Amino acid sequence: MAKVHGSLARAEKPKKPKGRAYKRLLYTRRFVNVTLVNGKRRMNPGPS
Amino acid sequence: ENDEVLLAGFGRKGKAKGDIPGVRFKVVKVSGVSLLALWKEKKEKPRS
Amino acid sequence: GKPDKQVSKLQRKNKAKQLRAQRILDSIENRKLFEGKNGAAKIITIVPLVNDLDPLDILYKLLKCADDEGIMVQEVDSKRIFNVHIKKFKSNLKIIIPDMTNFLNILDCAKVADFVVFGLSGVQEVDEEFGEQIIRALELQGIASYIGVISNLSAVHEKEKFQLDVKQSLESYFKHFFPSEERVYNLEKNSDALNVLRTLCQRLPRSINWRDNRGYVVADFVDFVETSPDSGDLVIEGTVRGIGFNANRLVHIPDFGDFQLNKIEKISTVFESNMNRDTLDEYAPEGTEDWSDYDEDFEYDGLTTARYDDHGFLPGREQTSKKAAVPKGTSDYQAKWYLDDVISPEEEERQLREFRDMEKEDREFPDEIELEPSESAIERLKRYRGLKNLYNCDWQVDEKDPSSPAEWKRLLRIGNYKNTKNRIIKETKNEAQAIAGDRIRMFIRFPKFLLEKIQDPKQLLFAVYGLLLHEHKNAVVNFSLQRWEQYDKPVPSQEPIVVQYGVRRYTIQPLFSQGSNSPNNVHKYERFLHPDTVSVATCIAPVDFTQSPAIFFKPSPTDAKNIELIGHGTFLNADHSRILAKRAILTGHPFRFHKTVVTVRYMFFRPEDVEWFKSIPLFTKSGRSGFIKESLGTHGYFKATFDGKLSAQDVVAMSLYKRMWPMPSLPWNG
RNA sequence: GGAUAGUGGCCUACCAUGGUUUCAACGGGUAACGGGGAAUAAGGGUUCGAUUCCGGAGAGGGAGCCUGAGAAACGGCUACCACAUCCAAGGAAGGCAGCAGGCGCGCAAAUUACCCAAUCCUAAUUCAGGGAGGUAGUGACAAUAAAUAACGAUACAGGGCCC
RNA sequence: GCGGUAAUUCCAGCUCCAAUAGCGUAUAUUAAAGUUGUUGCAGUUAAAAAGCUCGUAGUUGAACUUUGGGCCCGGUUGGCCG
RNA sequence: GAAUUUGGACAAACUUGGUCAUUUAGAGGAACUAAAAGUCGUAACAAGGUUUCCGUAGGUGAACCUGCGGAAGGAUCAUUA
Numbered sequence A: 001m002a003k004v005h006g007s008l009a010r011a012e013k014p015k016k017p018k019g020r021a022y023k024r025l026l027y028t029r030r031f032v033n034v035t036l037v038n039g040k041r042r043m044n045p046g047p048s
Numbered sequence B: 001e002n003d004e005v006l007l008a009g010f011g012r013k014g015k016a017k018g019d020i021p022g023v024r025f026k027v028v029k030v031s032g033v034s035l036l037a038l039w040k041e042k043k044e045k046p047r048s
Numbered sequence C: 001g002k003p004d005k006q007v008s009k010l011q012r013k014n015k016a017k018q019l020r021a022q023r024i025l026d027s028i029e030n031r032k033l034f035e036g037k038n039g040a041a042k043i044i045t046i047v048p049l050v051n052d053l054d055p056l057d058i059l060y061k062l063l064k065c066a067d068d069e070g071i072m073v074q075e076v077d078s079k080r081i082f083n084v085h086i087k088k089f090k091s092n093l094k095i096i097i098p099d100m101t102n103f104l105n106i107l108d109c110a111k112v113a114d115f116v117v118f119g120l121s122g123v124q125e126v127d128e129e130f131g132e133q134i135i136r137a138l139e140l141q142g143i144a145s146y147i148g149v150i151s152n153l154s155a156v157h158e159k160e161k162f163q164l165d166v167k168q169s170l171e172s173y174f175k176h177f178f179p180s181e182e183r184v185y186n187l188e189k190n191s192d193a194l195n196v197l198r199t200l201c202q203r204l205p206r207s208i209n210w211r212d213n214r215g216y217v218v219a220d221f222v223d224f225v226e227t228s229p230d231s232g233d234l235v236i237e238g239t240v241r242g243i244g245f246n247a248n249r250l251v252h253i254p255d256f257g258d259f260q261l262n263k264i265e266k267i268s269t270v271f272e273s274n275m276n277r278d279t280l281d282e283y284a285p286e287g288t289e290d291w292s293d294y295d296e297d298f299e300y301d302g303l304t305t306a307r308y309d310d311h312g313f314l315p316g317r318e319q320t321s322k323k324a325a326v327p328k329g330t331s332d333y334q335a336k337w338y339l340d341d342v343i344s345p346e347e348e349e350r351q352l353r354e355f356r357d358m359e360k361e362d363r364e365f366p367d368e369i370e371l372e373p374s375e376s377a378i379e380r381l382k383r384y385r386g387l388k389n390l391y392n393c394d395w396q397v398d399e400k401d402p403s404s405p406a407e408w409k410r411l412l413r414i415g416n417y418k419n420t421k422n423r424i425i426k427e428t429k430n431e432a433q434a435i436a437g438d439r440i441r442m443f444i445r446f447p448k449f450l451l452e453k454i455q456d457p458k459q460l461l462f463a464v465y466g467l468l469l470h471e472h473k474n475a476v477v478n479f480s481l482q483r484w485e486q487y488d489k490p491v492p493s494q495e496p497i498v499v500q501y502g503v504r505r506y507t508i509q510p511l512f513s514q515g516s517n518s519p520n521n522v523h524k525y526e527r528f529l530h531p532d533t534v535s536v537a538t539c540i541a542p543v544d545f546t547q548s549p550a551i552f553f554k555p556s557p558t559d560a561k562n563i564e565l566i567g568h569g570t571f572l573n574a575d576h577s578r579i580l581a582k583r584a585i586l587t588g589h590p591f592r593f594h595k596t597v598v599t600v601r602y603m604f605f606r607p608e609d610v611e612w613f614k615s616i617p618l619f620t621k622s623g624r625s626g627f628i629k630e631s632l633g634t635h636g637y638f639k640a641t642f643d644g645k646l647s648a649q650d651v652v653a654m655s656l657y658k659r660m661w662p663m664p665s666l667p668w669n670g
Numbered sequence D: 001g002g003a004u005a006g007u008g009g010c011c012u013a014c015c016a017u018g019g020u021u022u023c024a025a026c027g028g029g030u031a032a033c034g035g036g037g038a039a040u041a042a043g044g045g046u047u048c049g050a051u052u053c054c055g056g057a058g059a060g061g062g063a064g065c066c067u068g069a070g071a072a073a074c075g076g077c078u079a080c081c082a083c084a085u086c087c088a089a090g091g092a093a094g095g096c097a098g099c100a101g102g103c104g105c106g107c108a109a110a111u112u113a114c115c116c117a118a119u120c121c122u123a124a125u126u127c128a129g130g131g132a133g134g135u136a137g138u139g140a141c142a143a144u145a146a147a148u149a150a151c152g153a154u155a156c157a158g159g160g161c162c163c
Numbered sequence E: 001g002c003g004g005u006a007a008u009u010c011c012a013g014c015u016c017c018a019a020u021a022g023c024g025u026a027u028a029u030u031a032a033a034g035u036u037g038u039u040g041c042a043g044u045u046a047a048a049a050a051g052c053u054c055g056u057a058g059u060u061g062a063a064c065u066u067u068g069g070g071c072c073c074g075g076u077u078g079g080c081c082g
Numbered sequence F: 001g002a003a004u005u006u007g008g009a010c011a012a013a014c015u016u017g018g019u020c021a022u023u024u025a026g027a028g029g030a031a032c033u034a035a036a037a038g039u040c041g042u043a044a045c046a047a048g049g050u051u052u053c054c055g056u057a058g059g060u061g062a063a064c065c066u067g068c069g070g071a072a073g074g075a076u077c078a079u080u081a
């Protein structure tokens, strides 16, 4: 909502990397460290 | 009411058996503020 | 019938040229209110949002960039309100600087303006508890054209490279509340100052609905004339803006009240109030004559069962033939079988803790009652009702009750608000003797003893507001009510809460309900304000016919601003038809289970009590319906039938209802 | 014959009775300046082109004319029409569709900034002048490039590679 | 498209996906559209062969008139040799 | 050689009626809407019509019949030559 005047630049859980880095993450989330669940590639599962 | 409202297009087709009609416009802005930003509590509304 | 159309080049060009010539004419007419040579009065109010900031300085900049040292020097000596005519653009400005120690004085200042300038600090970040609230509250009550301007920018680094940073961060802060603008102007530079002055002069100020539809005069000179020893005539020299004033209509003056007019003269004719005078009385004596047919005067003393006869059992008659058997010492049973014939900080803290506790209790357990064994349930709820569907059955508005307020008859019963509003506003527009842009002597009748509080029109703003028809007359009003940001605190529905709508402020003990539309106009009485959604606040207060935005607050002496801003919203309806039923839930545990009949425990403690509530439906928060059968023991256990199969984890409940009445309101001053 | 720098119904007399047309004249529409070109499609197309170069037209709307090689010129003149300014009430001035800037209009568009140093133009002219043009400001029109992290050890944790 | 005590289909959080200093939305337009069809549609029953013939503009229009043989000239690629 | 004047071509513009075309402010009147409310008519009342069509004519009526000419876009059994 209201960030106070102090947006003057000059004078929680872990974050996700941005840009290139993020893609890297995905490349290993899907191809270096493959997770084969129930005979399929499951993305976003809870308890199974 | 009496509020300035910036409108755009909106594609809701009306239906026959229930007498639902097709409005063709959605409010995009009210009083100069974006309907979205209000709805995100991002910006506040000057009320006049 | 009629043939078709084939518009030519010429026809087209002409319709265009006419449309645009008309547009231009109308625009000139609408831009003639500020003919800066004789008939103009552009009110600019200067509002700094930072403690360590001087408004006099902000003005100094704006008028030093007009190259007029005299008009600056002549103001330092002794003034706070100025009549400054700029020759560069030919314009008549009126500058107002508020008492920045009084919050409500700030609001009063801006709420009359055509323009609101905001002072911003390059040094000090705006306060979350004060200046921010200035922004929001101004914004809610109504603002015309606003501007964002700075003065402290030179106080930072001398190199522009760092100043522009501050400027832009301020721009993005200011954009948040006021997206209409994207440029916070810097007075330090001659260009921006010349430009903001330029705008104030030239640019036409937008309209604030409620203030423009009832007229207003900012007073320059206020004199008093003695007529009678105990009362006289306040004379007020000022220019009319808005819709204008009529001699017959009343005039409000903030922190003074509503008064009636005696004479009005123009200096750009003489009009005097005649026989069509609006009178200085709340409850009109014609309101007593309007509510003459009292329809339901039901006697709850003449009841053997709960009032629910519309959907319940039948009037059971119990003719008691009691004869006395004379065996010494004998049960009521033997006797029933012998003569049978057939034919201050501590207080606030403790109380407030208790209110928070009761509110959270009201969230976890809504409207439930806890009956004691000694408590006769019948008596304790004897006045209540027990309707099946709260939005279907036939509650009525015209019912007579000892709990109803004495004044209830004497109230202004507007049939339709939406139409009455329009009709009366058109009346006021047509019957306006004194239009906008007129200089006026206003002769108002006035009780002498209040002359002590009246200040000087140059050090303190003195505004004179118009009222419409019957606006002095009380009525049953419904407000829209929404909580102020960052306000978790509890707010019950009977405590005094000051309300500002229009310019008028009345302390109110408002009944909170949910404005969910009902076919019978009957709404649940919510003891405490809902923490998430828009609610409705109903009470007996004077009418408003322009749907003014309302500010709800509770005066707190400790805070800088001597005001705790509770909530906001709008004057919705002048309606009496809204009835409010206090619900009352009775709770009971389903003891034992048979394949169709459930024995229920701890909801009564006498069998006669169970008799009394037989017809009343039973609902379970598991979402299931049912009814009672008969009383088991001499302890109030009762057998019951239901819709589905219920376990010992469910709660069987009763809903009983009572009429809740709006409460009288008194004006608020100081 | 007259007029024009000159051909020419361009105009004037006098003669003829012609000229265009379903191969679409004439009229009406265009939220139409024309082209170089732009978007998109395998191709063929469809759709844009107010806008950086070329050509034309206009300078609030019409008409008229001085000067001059060249203007039917409007940062020249005259009148009428529409607006509009100063006045001491007699009069006198006015055209931003040039650069900035304001109002209005709208869904919709920037600074009342610095300079002749480039580019080129004008002049009696190497020097003067040029909001033509250039430079910066504003601006998420677009278009290009591409930060927001790279490693290691450790341990826990597992899989795989050969004994 | 899909339901209601128990909802992957609504609301909030958690998670994940896509494109990423950019991404959504509106109007227009091109593609998709062989739904404008010259290239390239369709016309018994799905929209669509004029009731029928005659007839000018228009579009369209059978076959046939130096073929066949002989000689010479010099080019530009490609092979087998260099 | 100035004021002034004769007649021309060029020709803005004005006045007037008449005519279409619009912008308008008003008044005359008529008709449609319901997140309005209730009232009867038939709602809260019961069924009946069911070859279907085409052109045309008429009748009406609250609808629908009906005359003439067309069409199958309508369900060929049996015997025999």
Ligand SMILES: [Mg+2]
Binding pocket: D032
């Ligand atoms: Mg055009």
Ligand SMILES: [Mg+2]
Binding pocket: D041
């Ligand atoms: Mg294609």
Ligand SMILES: [Mg+2]
Binding pocket: D049
């Ligand atoms: Mg072009």
Ligand SMILES: [Mg+2]
Binding pocket: D050
């Ligand atoms: Mg154009």
Ligand SMILES: [Mg+2]
Binding pocket: none
């Ligand atoms: Mg050009």
Ligand SMILES: [Mg+2]
Binding pocket: none
């Ligand atoms: Mg020209």
Ligand SMILES: [Mg+2]
Binding pocket: D060
């Ligand atoms: Mg112009």
Ligand SMILES: [Mg+2]
Binding pocket: D068
């Ligand atoms: Mg010359």
Ligand SMILES: [Mg+2]
Binding pocket: D074
């Ligand atoms: Mg000209």
Ligand SMILES: [Mg+2]
Binding pocket: D075, D096
């Ligand atoms: Mg010019």
Ligand SMILES: [Mg+2]
Binding pocket: none
């Ligand atoms: Mg020029």
Ligand SMILES: [Mg+2]
Binding pocket: D096
């Ligand atoms: Mg310009």
Ligand SMILES: [Mg+2]
Binding pocket: D116
């Ligand atoms: Mg130079």
Ligand SMILES: [Mg+2]
Binding pocket: none
């Ligand atoms: Mg330029």
Ligand SMILES: [Mg+2]
Binding pocket: D140, D141, D142
């Ligand atoms: Mg861009």
Ligand SMILES: [Mg+2]
Binding pocket: E035, E041, E042
């Ligand atoms: Mg097709």
